[model samples]
Structures are given as structure tokens and as C-alpha cells.
Target: MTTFKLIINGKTLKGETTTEAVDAATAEKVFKQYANDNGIDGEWTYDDATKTFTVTE
Candidate 1:
């Protein structure tokens, strides 16, 4: 298992999964899942080229 760190709208959050690595697509999915589960509504974008994720208000 591996731990993932994310920066969304300048806020840092942590996630853990058994996957060895987290790509842009997966990262976006995970972020969305977390946000939705937490009742947060926003926009998220993932850059495949840079493997970066961003969340917008």
C-alpha cells in the first residue's frame, strides 16, 4: 500500500491505497470520491502531462 498526498485549492489532504502509484486519472477519481463523500462540491482537473491535480472553487 502507498499513501498519496494531494493539494486541492491550496489545501493539503492525504489518501491511502494499495496501488503502487497514482496517475492523474486515478488521482482525480480519488479526489472526487473524497470530496463527494464529504459533501463538498467543486471542480477538479488533472493534468496528465504533469501528473498534477487541481481543485477549483
Candidate 2:
């Protein structure tokens, strides 16, 4: 599992999943759903070193 951090409008929220890191497509899809459900928008980036996501406007 890994933590996904979505940063938008200067704020941050986190989501996690059981999907392994190798399954980037699944992880990204899961992350995108979380963002959509929460009305989050911006550019999304991944931090390989820390296993995090950052979305910025």
C-alpha cells in the first residue's frame, strides 16, 4: 500500500490503497476518483521517493 496526497488550493488530503506501486494505472485511477468525488482539480504529480501525490493549481 501507498499514500496518495492530493494538494489543491493550498490544502492537502490523503488517500491510500492496497494496490501495489507497480500497478500505477490502478493507483492513478483510484486517486483520480477520490479527487473527482471531492471536487478536486489541478495538476497531479507523483513523488517516487516518498510515494505521494501532489495536485496543484
Candidate 3:
């Protein structure tokens, strides 16, 4: 599984693992919804090399 770092509110959030492959828009959409639901705001990105997702508002 591909590992990912979910960032929320400009900080590094708990990491996660993917069950399947994903694309840019889907990845962002998934995280974005999570943030919206949880009341967080920021931009998210997926890094292939570090497997890190960063959020910047």
C-alpha cells in the first residue's frame, strides 16, 4: 500500500495508507472533504518520493 502524510490546518497530520492507487484530483478531493467535514482549511499535495501530504492555507 502507498503511504501518505495527511496535512491539515498547515500542520502535519497523522499519516495514512492507501488501499489502492490514486490520482491527483481524487487525492485532493478526499483530503479536502475530510478537512471540510472536520472544519479544517488548507491546500493538500501528494509527494511521490517522500509519501508526504502537505497542507498550506
Candidate 4:
């Protein structure tokens, strides 16, 4: 398993999954759900080194 970080706004959320890294589809799905539920608009960008996803406004 590997770590995954999702940054929404300025908040950071840490997670771990069975896979070594999250795929593009998984990242997009998570981003879409969060955007819809929270009424936010942004695009997700992944950092390979940090295993982080930062949403851009």
C-alpha cells in the first residue's frame, strides 16, 4: 500500500490504499464527488513524488 493525499482548498486529507498509487480515473472520480458534494470547482493535479493531489482553482 501507498499513501495518498488530497488537498481541498487548504485542507489536507491523508489516505492509504492497497495499490501503490492511485490511477487517473480514481483521482478524477474522487475529485468529482468532492466537488459536487462541497460545491467547489477545481481540477486535480497529482504529485508523483509526494503522492498528493492538489486541487487548483
The numbered model that scores best in TM-score is 2
**Tens digits of per-residue lDDT for model 4 on 1-57?**
344566666233333322233575575566556655665456667788866766644
Name the runs in model 1 displaced over 4 angstroms.
Answer: 1-5, 10-22
Off by over 4 Å in 4: 10-24
Q: Per-residue error at 49 for model 2, in Å?
A: 0.9
Encode model 1's per-residue lDDT on 1-57: one tens digit a residue.
223334445233344222234454465567667666654455555555544455543
lDDT of 3 at 52: 60
Write one digit per residue (lDDT tens) for candidate 2, span 1-57: 554444444245444433444555567787677777676677778777766666653
Q: How high a TM-score does candidate 3 get?
A: 0.48
Name the weakest run of 10 consecutive residues (lDDT summed) in model 1.
10-19
Query: Of 1 and 4, which scores higher on lDDT?
Result: 4
Model 3: per-residue Cα lDDT at residue 16: 49
Least lDDT summed over 10 consecutive residues: which range in candidate 3? 12-21
Better of 3 and 4 by TM-score: 4
- Candidate 3 per-residue C-alpha lDDT over 1-57 given as tens digits, one digit per residue, 9 for 90 to 100: 444456554444444434222655455566666666665567566677776666665
lDDT score, residue 11, model 1? 34
lDDT at 50, model 4: 68
The candidate that achieves the highest lDDT relative to the unseen native structure: 2
| TM-score between candidate 1 and the true structure | 0.42
